[PDB]
């Protein structure tokens, strides 16, 4: 069991460095979001406040 | 060399056929040769290893030690000879896995089906 | 262990029925002991023994019906050959080998003669 319980701690490390709050946090970061960078904003109605 | 069309000479085929072979085909691969005592006796070079045979290691650090097989561990392509172990630091004992091509059989454990196998491959047995 | 295949085939229909109910009384009891004990490996063997009885009882009832319809046309659909769909919907060996009466006079008259060119 202590052989098996230490293998839970060995396999947990990679998710802790990425600050995953579980073994079930698989929220994926989009590399480049479309609304941030694709636009040209001139006189008129604009894309935000 | 190769003179047939069904046989393969490809490296990627031969490893994959080895690593995913089922247990009945692992039996023929885990075979051990007989000693020059028994080769003169029965008249047969090699046999598949069995659980209850007696054997002598001939290559490795454990050369010169002999003992009965405990169990043929086909899933690791290995054999665990009894009385050949490493004791751990805490007194516990761990068997050492051996490959049976480096073994030499000195005594055979004969069943009915092993006799007919010796008859099949040309043996004299008695 | 458990029950054997060939031993149950010699038994009768009344005994293969009473074999099975006594097995299911055991499998009821071993599911009770499964919660008290942590691990109970015996319950595998009594489970396959119930399946070995049901194969033999099904077989003796099916080989009865085959000899019931033996030598009589229109046996039921699960008892026929399974072969495949497109081969059951096809011409039989008699019907494809049928040939009209005009050809049959011709093949008698002029078969492919066997010859050779050497001399």
């Amino acid at each position: 069991r202590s052989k098996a319980d230490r293998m839970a701690k060995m396999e947990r490390r990679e998710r802790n460095r990425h600050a995953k709050q579980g073994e079930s946090d698989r929220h994926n970061a989009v590399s480049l979001s479309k609304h941030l960078f694709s636009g040209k904003r001139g006189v008129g109605k604009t894309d935000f406040r | 060399a190769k003179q047939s069309l069904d046989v393969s000479s490809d490296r990627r085929k031969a490893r994959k056929a080895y690593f995913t072979a089922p247990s009945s085909q692992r039996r023929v691969l885990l075979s051990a040769p007989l000693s020059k005592e028994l080769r003169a006796q029965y008249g047969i070079k090699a046999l598949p290893i069995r659980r209850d045979d007696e054997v002598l290691v001939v290559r490795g650090s454990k050369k010169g030690q002999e003992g009965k097989i405990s169990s043929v561990y086909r899933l690791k392509f290995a054999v665990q000879v009894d009385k050949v172990t490493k004791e751990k630091v805490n007194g516990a004992s761990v068997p050492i896995n051996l490959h049976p091509s480096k073994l030499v059989i000195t005594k055979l454990h004969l069943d009915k089906d092993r006799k007919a196998l010796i008859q099949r491959k040309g043996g004299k047995l008695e | 262990a458990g029950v054997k295949a060939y031993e149950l085939r010699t038994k009768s229909k009344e005994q293969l029925a009473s074999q099975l109910v006594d097995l299911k009384k055991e499998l009821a009891e071993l599911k009770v002991q499964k919660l008290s004990r942590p691990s109970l490996p015996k319950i595998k063997t009594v489970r396959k023994s119930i399946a070995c009885v049901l194969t033999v009882i099904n077989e003796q009832q099916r080989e009865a019906v085959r000899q019931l319809y033996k030598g009589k046309k229109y046996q039921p659909k699960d008892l026929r050959a399974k072969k495949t769909r497109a081969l059951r919907r096809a011409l039989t060996k008699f019907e494809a080998s049928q040939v009209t009466e005009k050809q049959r006079k011709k093949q008698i008259a002029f078969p492919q003669r066997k010859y050779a060119i050497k001399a």
Binding site: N28, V30, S31, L32, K34, F37 | - | -
Partner: protein, 52 residues
């Protein structure tokens, strides 16, 4: 392969101050979305002059 590299549905975004002109993978949420494709320089893109 004749279709290797073209199993993507990218489209270019336009001309901004802070981004290039390569067609990018549409949609969002996987991490492949927003990466370059269909170019010889892109990761996961086809090569130049596919050998026939």
């Amino acid at each position: 392969s004749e279709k290797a590299g073209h199993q993507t549905s990218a489209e270019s975004w336009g001309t901004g101050r802070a981004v290039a002109r390569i067609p990018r993978v549409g949609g969002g949420g996987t991490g492949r979305s927003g990466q370059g494709a269909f170019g010889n320089m892109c990761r996961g893109g086809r090569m130049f002059a596919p050998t026939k």
